[PDB]
Amino acid sequence: MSGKKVEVQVKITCNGKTYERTYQLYAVRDEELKEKLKKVLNERMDPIKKLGCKRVRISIRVKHSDAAEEKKEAKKFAAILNKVFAELGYNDSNVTWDGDTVTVEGQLEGVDLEHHHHHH
């Protein structure tokens, strides 16, 4: 993988405002971009939970570098995101791609939906 300087726009709706910001994320390695997503999300959502909401509507649009690369890199970046949201407490169904953007929702404050009671 090349040193991918991508523009990642984290657009999060909470309370009654939408907070979007274009971040410049540089990663030579795939694992590097994973932990950088955990950085940007966990840091930015820290005051958001304090602002207080029942649920947040997040929309992370990744910039497509080059037409040859971006077919492979967005498919790879789908897997990258699936790791990060799983590590932050967002469900698989909550993560859905539409309009070259990933729309991820999470139940704010009470950040859990899967209250499983399985016998054996």
59 within domain boundaries: yes
Torsion angle of the four alpha carbons 102, 105, 7, 49, in this order, in degrees rounded to the nearest 10? 180
60 within domain boundaries: yes
Residue 12: give the domain boundaries: 1-108
Rounded Cα–Cα distance for residues 85 and 12 (Å): 14
Rounded Cα–Cα distance for residues 74 and 115 (Å): 32
101 within domain boundaries: yes
Q: Name the domain count of the chain.
A: 1
Do residues 10 and 23 make contact, with C-beta atoms less than 8 angstroms apart?
yes
CATH number assigned to the domain comprising residue 11: 3.30.1710.10
* Phi, psi at 89, each rounded to 5°: 100, 50
**DSSP result, the chain:** ---EEEEEEEEEEETTEEEEEEEEEEESSHHHHHHHHHHHHHHHHHHHHHH--S-EEEEEEEPP--HHHHHHHHHHHHHHHHHHHHHHT--TTTEEE-SSEEEEEE-SSS----------
Rounded Cα–Cα distance for residues 90 and 100 (Å): 20
116 within domain boundaries: no
